[PDB]
Design a protein around this ligand. Sequence first.
Ligand SMILES: CCCCCCCC/C=C/CCCCCCCC(=O)O[C@@H](COC(=O)CCCCCCCCCCCCCCC)COP(=O)([O-])OCC[N+](C)(C)C
Ligand SMILES: CCCCCCCC/C=C\CCCCCCCC(=O)O[C@@H](COC(=O)CCCCCCCCCCCCCCC)COP(=O)([O-])OCC[N+](C)(C)C
Ligand SMILES: CC(=O)[C@H]1CC[C@H]2[C@@H]3CC=C4C[C@@H](OS(=O)(=O)O)CC[C@]4(C)[C@H]3CC[C@]12C
Ligand SMILES: CC(=O)[C@H]1CC[C@H]2[C@@H]3CC=C4C[C@@H](OS(=O)(=O)O)CC[C@]4(C)[C@H]3CC[C@]12C
Lengths: 49, 182, 281, 51, 98, 91, 46
Amino acid sequence: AFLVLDRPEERITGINDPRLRNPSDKFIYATVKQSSVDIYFRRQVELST
Amino acid sequence: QPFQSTLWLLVGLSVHVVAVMLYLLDRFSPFALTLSSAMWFSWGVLLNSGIGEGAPRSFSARILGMVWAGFAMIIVASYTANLAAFLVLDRPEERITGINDPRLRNPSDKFIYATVKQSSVDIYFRRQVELSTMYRHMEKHNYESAAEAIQAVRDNKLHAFIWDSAVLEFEASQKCDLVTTG
Amino acid sequence: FLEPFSADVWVMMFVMLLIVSAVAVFVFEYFSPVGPSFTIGKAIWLLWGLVFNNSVPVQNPKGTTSKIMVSVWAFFAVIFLASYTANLAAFMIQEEYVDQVSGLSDKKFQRPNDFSPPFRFGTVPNGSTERNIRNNYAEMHAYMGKFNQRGVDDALLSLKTGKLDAFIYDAAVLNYMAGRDEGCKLVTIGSGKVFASTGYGIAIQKDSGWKRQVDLAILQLFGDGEMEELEALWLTGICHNEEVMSSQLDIDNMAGVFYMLGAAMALSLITFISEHLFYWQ
Amino acid sequence: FTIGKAIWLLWGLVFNNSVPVQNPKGTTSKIMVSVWAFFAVIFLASYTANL
Amino acid sequence: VYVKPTLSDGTCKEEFTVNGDPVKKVICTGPNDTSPGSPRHTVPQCCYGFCIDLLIKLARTMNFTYEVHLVADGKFGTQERVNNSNKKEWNGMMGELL
Amino acid sequence: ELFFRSGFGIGMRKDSPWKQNVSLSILKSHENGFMEDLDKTWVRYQECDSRSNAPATLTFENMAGVFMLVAGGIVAGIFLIFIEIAYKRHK
Amino acid sequence: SGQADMIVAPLTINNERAQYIEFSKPFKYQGLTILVKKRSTLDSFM
Ligand SMILES: CCCCCCCC/C=C/CCCCCCCC(=O)O[C@@H](COC(=O)CCCCCCCCCCCCCCC)COP(=O)([O-])OCC[N+](C)(C)C
Ligand SMILES: CCCCCCCC/C=C\CCCCCCCC(=O)O[C@@H](COC(=O)CCCCCCCCCCCCCCC)COP(=O)([O-])OCC[N+](C)(C)C
Ligand SMILES: CC(=O)[C@H]1CC[C@H]2[C@@H]3CC=C4C[C@@H](OS(=O)(=O)O)CC[C@]4(C)[C@H]3CC[C@]12C
Ligand SMILES: CC(=O)[C@H]1CC[C@H]2[C@@H]3CC=C4C[C@@H](OS(=O)(=O)O)CC[C@]4(C)[C@H]3CC[C@]12C
């Protein structure tokens, strides 16, 4: 039972993850300046946070 | 169940190959095991019974006696391991996950689901245009009362019933062949 | 059966077996006031049998100290076997599978006849998969002609019946059909591997003014996020969520333990032969 | 080989054969003990696997 | 709301909870059992349950008397369209209340 | 899960007399398997990886505790042997 | 600006960039993903 249930958890599931959906100062996530990622987040109003 | 039929035969036949070999390997050696004592040694190691007082005498037979002891350990260990895998990895599941399930969203004729006619559930699906496909499927299968729809799922005539959780969770507890999902 | 107990653990048990054997017969049994002589031959045999689920006839030592040493070895052996079985169960419970077929360049797809009993693969004609396979794999195309399928649904049922064992078709369609499949028993090789990668496009009249307008509109949907909403609404499936399934233990799985036994048959001859050469001289 | 010696032998076998016993001297009684040993091997393997 | 037939006396069969408390019952007067379609009658049944116990508490703490009957349609209530008159009307208990 | 599934393109200006033949030479290279050649030699390397569950074998760092008990039962034994003779010496 | 006549790089096809430059058909289909930081913990037989 010990050797089977050894499983870490708490992995980000995507941008819809509650960790990412709102800016928590404990969590730090970033992308590269001036790229398609930036002009994807800034264009969409829903994920403005 | 854990072993195949031909693996049961190969294990049983390898007992005799070891038993006959242990007899030859001990009899034809410079300075013992009879044929009967070698058969008892091989079955005693596999079956883990104390039956038989004979052990291989020659240096070469003891090596095969040592390895046969290890082989018989794995056969028993891998029976207990495969039995444990079979008994933990028994998950039928395949159960509906809420209203956003692809089976409900894009229904087939095999899967049938409905609610009670002229109730809040009907005017919830009818109100939302995004649930138009689900409404048509339920429209032809809607029931007069919830007791009939609950009896329908028990008799397999209906596969999913959408209703109030306060009522369904009472039937799931009272009746042991019904579960609420999603 | 090789998976638990990294080979360093097995090696150390053997050399601890020889250490414990030598101490128990030269320091604990020779020096004991009491103590059929307990030798190395019947100390290796005793301690070996203890590790492997004590079932062989043995000869225990008569000294009180050497009986303590065998007892603390018997405690090691119950931990050794409890931790071998426990980890062997953990492996069997948590093994993933390996797909039998690699890809479109596999041996079965290249030469099916020259291989084992013929591999039955085909496709729906008059499309782009044939045009990609006529031009690239000429020998594949000839063998595929006799296994043609009239439609996608036909090839779905032929796979279940057994008339076909591989359907070569468009990736987006196959991903969907492999998604809403009952029992999740039809899968695409490579966990979604795609060859001759391309996309679905809107065909517009050549040299027309609408190509730019349509292109910018489609790219807006990706940026505005409608494509992921559409993908979850149409292309999602039951089987896309997730496995591990219980399996029996046929000989092909257990061939390794028999080869180890069959090799001890081989090692027994060599020492048996070496005895006569050593006995002659 | 008494009946109280057969119960002790068969009980030890079914519980991870570990006690000093007296095996029968016959042959068809030895076959029966071996048959019981197979049951005892399966019985304990199933107890551990389901536990 | 459990609906059960009344005894030949016309009263409600006496039952108790698991603890031993008496089950409060109300003589309903709903439609005849097995639907009122062919046997159109209002047979007085016996009613008890969560909503009846709450109704008895409401009546006691607000001092009103009551007469409980079951909805004739058997429905809960939905504004079904009447294509005949290009209008809408409620059914079930919603129609009875309005 | 992947989001914003937009691919990689070759950028050229609006005029781009090469715009049409660049795209036709990219669709052609997908069908020819040329891009699968490039994926093999530049993208598919797989230096090291693991699964999510990944059952792990028991190394010596795991089993060293019980191997230090048989070793400790030897030094205890070479002490206990002296008591054995000394006890037998008296009687 | 005229400095370059082509961009042979992992340039993502976007609605913003497509209004000014002519992208080719994709030579690589992909998407956005999140990168995060990554045996046996059996202490002893006890
Ligand atoms: C713990 C780890 C192992 C350790 C010990 C290993 C021991 C190795 C022993 C190996 C012996 C050989 C294997 C025989 C296979 C029988 C197949 C068969 O028809 O089974 C039948 C059943 O049968 C039984 O229930 C058991 C019958 C055993 C008869 C005795 C054989 C000889 C004993 C030894 C004499 C020498 C043997 C020499 C052999 C050359 C039918 O099979 P089924 O219908 O699929 O299953 C039934 C259940 N069902 C109806 C619900 C589905
Ligand atoms: C498969 C079952 C069947 C077989 C059952 C056999 C029956 C057993 C019979 C009897 C046992 C009697 C009780 C004594 C056992 C120790 C208990 C204790 O408090 O130890 C402590 C100190 O221990 C250590 O840290 C050292 C242990 C390993 C090294 C060996 C030294 C000698 C210890 C033994 C001397 C020999 C004594 C001989 C005479 C009795 C435990 O330390 P911890 O940090 O709290 O450990 C927590 C575990 N953890 C690290 C995993 C989290
Ligand atoms: C009684 C015997 O003769 C058998 C019984 C169990 C066997 C062992 C099982 C696993 C391994 C691990 C393997 O190395 S590895 O890198 O593949 O883990 C090397 C071989 C080794 C040590 C076997 C040696 C032979 C045995 C001791
Ligand atoms: C004294 C002996 O006779 C034993 C001691 C160590 C044993 C070896 C341990 C590991 C393996 C790997 C295995 O690999 S497999 O892919 O075929 O499963 C095949 C069997 C083989 C070579 C064993 C052969 C028998 C031994 C030499």
